Amino acid sequence: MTRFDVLTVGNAIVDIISRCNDQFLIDNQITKAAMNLIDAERAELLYSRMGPALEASGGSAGNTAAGVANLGGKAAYFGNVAADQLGDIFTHDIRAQGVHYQTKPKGAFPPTARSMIFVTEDGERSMNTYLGACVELGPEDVEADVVADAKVTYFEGYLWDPPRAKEAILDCARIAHQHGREMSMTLSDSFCVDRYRGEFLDLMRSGKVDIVFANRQEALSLYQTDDFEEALNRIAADCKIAAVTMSENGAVILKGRERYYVNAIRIREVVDTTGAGDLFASGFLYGYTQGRSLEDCGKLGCLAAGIVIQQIGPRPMTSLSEAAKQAGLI
Amino acid sequence: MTRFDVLTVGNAIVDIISRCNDQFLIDNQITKAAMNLIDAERAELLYSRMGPALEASGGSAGNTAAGVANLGGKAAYFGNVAADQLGDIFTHDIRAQGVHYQTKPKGAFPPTARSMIFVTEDGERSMNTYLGACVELGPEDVEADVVADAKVTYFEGYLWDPPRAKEAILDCARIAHQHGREMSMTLSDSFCVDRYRGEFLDLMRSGKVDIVFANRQEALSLYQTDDFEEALNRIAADCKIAAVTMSENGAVILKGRERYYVNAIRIREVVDTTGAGDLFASGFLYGYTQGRSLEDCGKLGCLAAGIVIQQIGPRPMTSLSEAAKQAGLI
Numbered sequence: 279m280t281r282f283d284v285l286t287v288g289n290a291i292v293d294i295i296s297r298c299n300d301q302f303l304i305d306n307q308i309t310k311a312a313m314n315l316i317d318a319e320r321a322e323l324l325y326s327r328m329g330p331a332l333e334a335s336g337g338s339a340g341n342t343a344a345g346v347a348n349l350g351g352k353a354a355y356f357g358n359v360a361a362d363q364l365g366d367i368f369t370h371d372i373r374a375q376g377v378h379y380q381t382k383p384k385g386a387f388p389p390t391a392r393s394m395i396f397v398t399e400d401g402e403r404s405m406n407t408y409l410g411a412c413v414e415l416g417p418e419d420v421e422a423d424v425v426a427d428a429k430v431t432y433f434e435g436y437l438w439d440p441p442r443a444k445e446a447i448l449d450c451a452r453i454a455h456q457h458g459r460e461m462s463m464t465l466s467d468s469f470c471v472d473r474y475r476g477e478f479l480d481l482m483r484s485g486k487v488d489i490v491f492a493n494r495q496e497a498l499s500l501y502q503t504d505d506f507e508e509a510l511n512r513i514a515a516d517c518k519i520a521a522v523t524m525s526e527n528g529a530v531i532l533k534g535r536e537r538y539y540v541n542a543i544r545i546r547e548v549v550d551t552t553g554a555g556d557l558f559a560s561g562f563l564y565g566y567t568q569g570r571s572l573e574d575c576g577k578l579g580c581l582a583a584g585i586v587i588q589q590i591g592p593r594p595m596t597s598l599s600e601a602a603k604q605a606g607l608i
Numbered sequence: 609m610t611r612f613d614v615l616t617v618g619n620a621i622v623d624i625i626s627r628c629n630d631q632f633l634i635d636n637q638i639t640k641a642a643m644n645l646i647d648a649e650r651a652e653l654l655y656s657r658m659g660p661a662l663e664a665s666g667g668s669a670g671n672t673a674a675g676v677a678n679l680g681g682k683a684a685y686f687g688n689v690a691a692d693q694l695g696d697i698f699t700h701d702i703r704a705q706g707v708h709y710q711t712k713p714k715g716a717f718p719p720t721a722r723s724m725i726f727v728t729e730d731g732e733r734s735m736n737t738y739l740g741a742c743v744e745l746g747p748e749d750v751e752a753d754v755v756a757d758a759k760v761t762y763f764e765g766y767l768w769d770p771p772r773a774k775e776a777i778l779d780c781a782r783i784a785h786q787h788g789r790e791m792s793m794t795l796s797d798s799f800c801v802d803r804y805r806g807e808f809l810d811l812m813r814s815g816k817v818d819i820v821f822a823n824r825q826e827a828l829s830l831y832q833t834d835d836f837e838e839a840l841n842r843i844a845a846d847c848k849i850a851a852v853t854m855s856e857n858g859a860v861i862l863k864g865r866e867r868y869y870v871n872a873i874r875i876r877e878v879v880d881t882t883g884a885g886d887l888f889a890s891g892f893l894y895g896y897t898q899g900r901s902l903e904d905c906g907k908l909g910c911l912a913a914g915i916v917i918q919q920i921g922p923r924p925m926t927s928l929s930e931a932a933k934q935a936g937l938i
């Protein structure tokens with residue numbers, strides 16, 4: 279027995295969500311479908327231009343941990359908030375889902391991170407993130423016992439942006455591997471890959487990271503290639519297991535020379551694509567820590583991803599375990 | 609030439625919204641479908657038992673002002689928040705909708721009001737409100753010029769719960785009538801009517817309030833009768849205009865001896881009933897200040913109410929002015 283199936287580690291963020299049109303993105307120099315990093319002043323400026331919004335707990339790794347708990351897995355999370363109302367909200371949501379979350383705030387300032395997410399009529403999301411208290415996440419926030427007791431530890435590529443989070447992750451990898459556990463990462467965003475391509479490859483090649491998540495764009499960007507087949511071949515050579523999502527074209531899971539394709543789920547209405555990749559990882563890692571085939575892990579991933587894009591907010595409000603059972607994923 | 613069509617005055621609240629079952633309400637002694645007032649400690653207790661939530665600006669009068677702005681009217685709002693993150697969200701949302709909002713916060717404690725709203729599978733909402741900063745709303749928060757320049761000033765029955773808000777409302781009535789404008793109120797909630805029925809009747813009979821909004825239960829409650837026909841006849845005798853909503857049975861508008869019955873719109877499906885009454889008042893008062901017939905004002909209320917119950921959150925995120933056009937009402 280282990281205490282946890284999946285520990286995740288990431289930027290603790292509250293999402294501020296509003297609808298807009300494509301012209302709004304252009305007028306404001308917001309890169310569509312990307313994670314745009316912003317300072318405190320620009321956050322205020324974008325907020326002043328934004329329509330009425332809804333707030334929902336987010337953060338890539340936070341969403342993933344919540345999705346694992348929703349599916350019936352045992353999940354934990356490390357991530358730093360401030361002692362403020364947004365922090366109280368984040369703390370509440372993730373704990374209310376049954377995730378172990380014990381990272382202690384370090385005061386009220388800087389405040390808890392927010393991402394201004396503009397959702398266009400096609401359901402695509404464009405995020406604009408002020409990292410706030412996330413910049414504080416460091417080695418002191420690693421609960422060594424938790425990493426040791428977790429079957430998989432999963433972290434965001436996004437964590438290379440704040441300064442000391444990488445040191446926490448290197449500690450995680452050491453502890454995880456000392457206990458025969460596995461490490462996993464997501465590439466997060468193509469622009470993040472642009473920033474850290476070489477460091478990400480080295481994490482993979484040195485064996486610090488075992489299982490890598492990417493979408494098509496991130497995989498292309500990792501090798502700065504336009505040839506998807508080459509990207510798949512190279513990613514398979516660089517890590518133990520790769521799981522690559524291809525939007526409305528499903529997913530492919532790679533392990534050495536084996537490839538497992540997962541068919542493209544049909545979506546009646548896309549409300550908001552926020553959290554799709556995060557919930558793919560939830561379904562995959564839940565499957566993986568239950569000992570399911572790689573194909574079934576892929577299927578569980580696409581199931582969760584398909585559900586989250588049919589609602590507002592990045593964490594499914596319906597029962598994923600119920601959906602998985604109806605789907606025969608057991 | 610007036611500056612505003614509708615000024616509203618109410619408790620400035622952020623909604624904390626979560627799904628639950630009927631049993632949860634029973635277990636927690638929450639009165640289904642009512643506004644339950646709670647202290648700080650009970651708010652924390654209920655929060656600790658609530659599932660993951662979404663936050664959305666609320667407040668009955670706040671929602672009504674937002675709705676009037678959405679339809680294309682010119683709206684203002686008086687309501688008190690704290691200088692905290694929840695207050696910043698409230699301030700942002702109402703201003704982003706184009707509502708004039710200039711009430712000044714009076715420090716960080718008490719904090720901005722929150723309502724824990726539990727939504728059952730039938731879409732009904734049961735609210736649990738900690739008034740926080742709302743207790744500080746008083747005569748000093750009346751912008752005399754705004755009241756003078758508003759066609760209708762509308763306020764919540766809910767304002768009789770905090771101590772000093774009533775003095776502000778009496779000032780509004782004096783100013784509005786001196787300038788030849790009209791006063792309106794909503795009865796808010798059947799238990800609120802239980803608490804203040806004598807005060808409310810005095811407001812109506814003294815002519816401090818011209819137009820009264822109520823649902824069926826509130827109207828029955830005002831006269832402590834089971835006889836709805838008697839409730840309508842009496843309410844017509846006690847105010848200049850009454851608008852009484854009857855849920856799936858629509859509404860009835862009463863002026864002296866005139867009655868106009870109006871149908872509810874056909875609902876796709878009830879998601880969350882929060883704000884239905886507030887948005888009925890938005891549509892009615894929008895129509896009213898545009899000089900529409902009483903029947904057309906009823907029609908606009910039913911449309912607006914009908915839209916809000918088909919989404920999460922109490923303030924329509926789609927265009928009410930658009931929907932009014934497509935339904936041939938504008």
Ligand SMILES: Nc1ncnc2c1ncn2[C@@H]1O[C@H](CO)[C@@H](O)[C@H]1O
Binds near residue numbers: 293393555
């Ligand atoms: N810099 C970031 N680091 C981690 N997660 C982020 C970042 N920016 C946005 N997100 C999260 O991505 C999630 C969807 O993938 C959103 O809920 C949002 O909170």
Ligand SMILES: Nc1ncnc2c1ncn2[C@@H]1O[C@H](CO)[C@@H](O)[C@H]1O
Binds near residue numbers: 665669671
């Ligand atoms: N005491 C109160 N006063 C005014 N509005 C309230 C109160 N409690 C809940 N509400 C609001 O009622 C709205 C729905 O009518 C919700 O959005 C909620 O914020």
